[PDB]
């Protein structure tokens, strides 16, 4: 199938540049334009520009000219966007997305690349298990959680039992406090399956390459 695999999250200091990549697979790379789209947090999609992989021709949103440089490596079917002179106004999710010559649309999208422009240091999260106190009454289901505290930058992923529990999961949006993010994740499983069976939250913080697993214990 078509896949646009973007490079991972970026934390860059102001004034720096970043180059984000979009590895295209599953289709004839040179038959589609590659587009880049910015999405600031809570805001709409902004088209940055496109590049014709066939000849490297680019078309930019004037607003991003100079700011963004689109390139392509045909041989590696990878599109790149270099963003320069970075400020926190550039902190956003950036998508690559494919468009045919015709019809006119963005049919396949990368997963997005989160760019954080900040002088702040990477801070891995402290991961704390949230298990019921000894006094709690057991009902049909039990809610467990992991508190993911004091990390930066924002990208964090909590996986419960290697994704085998995701239908019962709540991911609470991170809140920024004193320059650090905190989030939590809950999972609700039948009480007949915990603690009889292991429930583990695995908290990945890509910026610090940290993974903390907490086995929820009564």
């Amino acid at each position: 199938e078509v896949q646009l695999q973007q490079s991972g999250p970026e934390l860059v200091k102001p004034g720096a540049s970043v180059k984000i990549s979009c590895k295209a697979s599953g289709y004839t790379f040179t038959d589609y334009y590659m587009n880049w789209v910015k999405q600031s947090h809570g805001k709409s999609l902004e088209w940055i520009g496109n590049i014709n992989p066939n000849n490297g021709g680019t078309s930019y949103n004037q607003k991003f000219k100079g700011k963004a440089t689109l390139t392509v490596d045909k041989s590696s079917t990878t599109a790149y966007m270099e963003l320069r002179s970075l400020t926190s106004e550039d902190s956003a999710v950036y998508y690559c997305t494919r468009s045919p010559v015709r019809p006119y649309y963005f049919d396949y999208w990368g997963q997005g690349t989160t760019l954080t422009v900040s002088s702040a240091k990477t801070t891995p999260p402290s991961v704390y298990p949230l298990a019921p106190g000894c006094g709690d009454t057991t009902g049909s289901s039990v809610t467990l959680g992991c508190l993911v505290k004091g990390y930066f930058p924002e990208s964090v992923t909590v996986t419960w039992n290697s994704g085998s529990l995701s239908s019962s999961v709540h991911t609470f949006p991170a809140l920024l406090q004193s320059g650090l993010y905190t989030m939590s994740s809950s999972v609700t499983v039948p009480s007949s399956t915990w603690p009889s069976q292991t429930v583990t939250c695995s908290v990945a913080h890509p910026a610090s390459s940290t993974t903390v697993d907490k086995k929820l214990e009564p």
């Binding site: 587009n35 789209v37 709409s44 999609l45 902004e46 088209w47 520009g49 078309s59 930019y60 949103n61 004037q62 607003k63 998508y95 997305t97 468009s99 019809p103 006119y104 649309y105 963005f106 049919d107 999208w109 990368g110 997963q111 997005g112 402290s126 704390y128 298990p129 949230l130 298990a131 019921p132 106190g133 000894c134 006094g135 709690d136 809610t143 959680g145 508190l147 505290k149 239908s167 709540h170 991911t171 609470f172 949006p173 991170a174 809140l175 406090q177 905190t182 989030m183 939590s184 809950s186 609700t188």
Partner: protein, 213 residues
Amino acid sequence: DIVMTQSHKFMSTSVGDRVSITCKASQDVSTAVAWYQQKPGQSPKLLIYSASYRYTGVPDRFTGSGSGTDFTFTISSVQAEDLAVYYCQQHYSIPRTFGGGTKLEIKRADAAPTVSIFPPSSEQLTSGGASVVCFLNNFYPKDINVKWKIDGSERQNGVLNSWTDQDSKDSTYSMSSTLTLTKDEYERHNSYTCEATHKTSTSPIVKSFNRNE
């Protein structure tokens, strides 16, 4: 630039209902309009292109209409999973431009929260921190009040509340309320309570633990 205006940032609907999201182009764009669905935390997904054509695999309940400047995206029978921001986009000229987005909000019946309170973990206490967290899960509507009481006394400082988006399965909300203390403070008190007040009952849902046992 062509401006694509979605004048409604939000539209409420109910599961099974028909909802139409409008988009107005600042100039004639013929039918060079696409509609995208962006679910929370996800990349946009193309649903409609050329104003009225469903992209491959797109369910029949999604339609688009319009030509010139006024475009409509319609979900004929909304499903909870359609909770998303919907964007129109013109592909008529450069730069490509998007509408501001319309977030579909799903009105379901009220649901009381399932409240869970968690004492600080031994790990955190070792760090000299004490976060007490209360999960208020799967409630509707979003409006909810959490009150923390420490030894019967309301505690307002150090409380951070985070709401989820509406659940794509049941359209409820969940929220976490975290009371962050120092370890020293936490151990100067015994009873920790989060009280959830929600329109589904005049009686707060109260979850508590005593640090002793």
